[model samples]
Target: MHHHHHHSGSLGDQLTSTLASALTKTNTLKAVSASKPSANVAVAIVTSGLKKALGALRINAGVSSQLTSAVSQAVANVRPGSSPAVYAKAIAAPSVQILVSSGSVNNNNAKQVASTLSENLVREMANTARRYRVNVPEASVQADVSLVTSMTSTFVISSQTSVQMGG
Candidate 1:
């Protein structure tokens, strides 16, 4: 029996979504929740990194990670509480949720894997740019990720980026 399990969306729809628009620039697609865990964690990750997957849809120039240091520092100055639900509730975006039967890395390994996944995804996106002939160097690229856990159970991740408009 031939079984097909791609249930996210119809091919036509996927081909016409924001994610599709992102790909034309340098095609990359990627994705998170957890606990007393820390909601600020998502904000911190968001501030420090660019969602490579998100950027793929928008980034033309190389991105810099430290660009949002001030804002992130400011978040630190105030000291935000760690709330996993903060992340469990999805950020508003032109995106959708797809279900898939998958494997789970133990929570211990999952954390590290999720953390490293962001950086690794970033580097991969940078390489994608080069392959597409984008003149930006990997060093010029900035990558960031979002992570969340629902405590001893779930892990959520997403790729993101920022926009600069003028000189």
Candidate 2:
């Protein structure tokens, strides 16, 4: 299901609505007390590295170690005690939790092949350069996810870049 915070109605109502649109269609995707985790480009890059290394070389050896070390160091440099690991909470989760506690030297391979799940998440994850505004902010794309938890935890995820129009 999909939800929208703000329809293309009046431009001002956007902040209150924009990304909120996707939140409208949540079957179940509640935000737990813990920060919801999101895997980023870095994680994808790491996975790619691990995949190729498995066959071509033991790239999973030291270099994979370095990636873990780098992420740790970087996180330590940023947030003390609290590393910038993947921050996520389970929806409809009874208790607040840190699902993926830390970065692993080992890649998380789905050995038990499960059914395919496609997350066209936050479709069009970008700001409108022309229609948005000049040097202003505007999010054009958003990911509307529907999970089976509550009637569903719904929320908008319009993105910071949405409104950050360029010169």
Candidate 3:
């Protein structure tokens, strides 16, 4: 006889809860916390954010167009013992910029929100990697988290400067 057991939760649920908690941390995004934007909305937001950020960087490409190429290039260039911090660094600026543009975050709380987002992302990525039978070094994960937080902070600082300068 064969039987199937179902788990009460899933990776997506975990990710959603993480996003909700991060979003709720900011007063501006508290409304989004009430309904808890689904993982779908989170994905859409990030995808659009990445596209806009790339455009702002003059890349002239969307996330979809670059997703495969970026991954392939990253993989090709990854050295034998290098940390995975590059992945986090790449997304950090765009994520923060989009949050600011969407009015979900502001200059004052940008660093805090970026910290939460970076931690959650690293955690989720680690879990997903394990599920795929891939193991990421703990040091690498920590490095990625730290890199994301600091990079996002830098982005916010630069953005704040531009706003102050009337750019």
lDDT per residue as tens, model 1, 32-142: 121121324434443423354334334222222332333244333433342322221122111122111112122134334333433444355344434333234443334
Instruction: Please report, in order, the local distance difference test score of every candidate based on alpha carbons.
Output: 0.29, 0.23, 0.39
TM-score order, best first, reads 3, 1, 2
Question: Each candidate: RMSD to true structure?
Answer: 18.2, 19.4, 18.4
Candidate 3 regions exceeding 4 Å error are 1-98, 150-156, 159-167
lDDT of 1: 0.29
Error (Å) of candidate 2 at residue 126 is: 25
Best by TM-score: 3
Model 3 lDDT per residue over 30-138, tens place: 2222334343333333344334334433433444245424433333343223232333322443343334334444545545555555455444544344433334567
Deviation from truth (RMSD, Å), model 2: 19.4
lDDT of 2 by residue, 53-87 (tens): 32232333554444334433332233222211211
Clashes of each: 22, 26, 0
Q: At residue 59, what lDDT does model 2 achieve? A: 31
